């Protein structure tokens, strides 16, 4: 079931030498990636490089998935009113895109990730909806 501690497994089972190479090629931005950043952060985490993923995080603090994912994940206590955790199925969608590219899941899991995120924006009649179905029907 495609998820956040399922993704960084697969960030586990790449290897060190492929780590390295998404470490490298995820810090420069590309046209149409999104969750570029957020995957570049993993990669430091799993590289057990705490130090520049924090400063990376950081830098995202805007996003309440990249809030998580440090607090979580790469320990840094909240400064901020204790706040309820957000939905990650869009990111974990984006996520598992790039790992379906860089050939290191199947596409099929891809492909639950957007259909969930379809369902949990459905759930709450989410006015993004539409912009989801553009982009699972892109990707997928």
Known sequence: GPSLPSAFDILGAAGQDKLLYLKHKLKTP????QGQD?????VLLKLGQE?????????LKADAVARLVARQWAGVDSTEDPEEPPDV?????????????EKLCPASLRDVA???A???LSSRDDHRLGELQDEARNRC
Not at 38 to 42: C, D, E, G, K
Not at 89 to 100: I, K, N
């Open 114 to 116: 957007y259909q969930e």
């Open 118 to 120: 379809v369902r949990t």
């Open 51 to 59: 130090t520049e993923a924090r400063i990376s995080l950081e830098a």
């Open 89 to 101: 199925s869009w990111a974990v969608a984006r996520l598992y895109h790039l790992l379906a590219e």
């Open 38 to 42: 957020l995957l570049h952060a993993m």
């Open 30 to 33: 590309r046209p149409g990636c």
